[PDB]
């Protein structure tokens, strides 16, 4: 356990915990989801909370959030997990991640990337130099 790790988890939690009251509500989740282009129903949002809500009180607190992370660090490799991740980027769903989409997704998730950083991130994964990242290239970067 390091200080830099805690800080990272703290800011991830803060992104969702809008009013900083120490809990993430279905309403707060909805806000972040909508800004990312997604449009879940109330039932879907509550479902998202319930799977991480260990004490079943209706909201997610820091310990539950941290536990979720620990469990996610165990397995990020399925297909459905990778596909799920790729789908977040591919906003329009045409099969490729463009620099514009990467920048938009990262900004709304609180990560400030420089134009140059965006391009380099894309370039490292762009196996066919077409300037985008398709599922295959995405999977190859994840599965290794």
């Amino acid at each position: 356990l390091t200080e830099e790790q805690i800080a990272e988890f703290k800011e991830a939690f803060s992104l969702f915990d809008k009013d900083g009251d120490g809990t993430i509500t279905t309403k707060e989740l909805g806000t972040v989801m909508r800004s990312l282009g997604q449009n879940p129903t109330e039932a879907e949002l509550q479902d998202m909370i319930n799977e991480v809500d260990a004490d079943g009180n209706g909201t997610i607190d820091f310990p539950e959030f941290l536990t979720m992370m620990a469990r996610k660090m165990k397995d990020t490799d399925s297909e459905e997990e990778i596909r799920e991740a790729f789908r977040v980027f591919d906003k329009d769903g045409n099969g490729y991640i463009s620099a514009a989409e990467l920048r938009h997704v990262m900004t709304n998730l609180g990560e400030k990337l420089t134009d140059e950083e965006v391009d380099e991130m894309i370039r490292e994964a762009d196996i066919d130099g077409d300037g985008q990242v398709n599922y295959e290239e995405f999977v190859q970067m994840m599965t290794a």
């Binding site: 990312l36 469990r71 996610k72 991740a85 977040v88 609180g110 490292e124 970067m141």
Partner: peptide, 24 residues
Amino acid sequence: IPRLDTLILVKAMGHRKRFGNPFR
């Protein structure tokens, strides 16, 4: 729809400024 942990996974990648599992 994506899971909450998938969102944190993506944020971490952005944080590392690189694609690929940002943890392991």
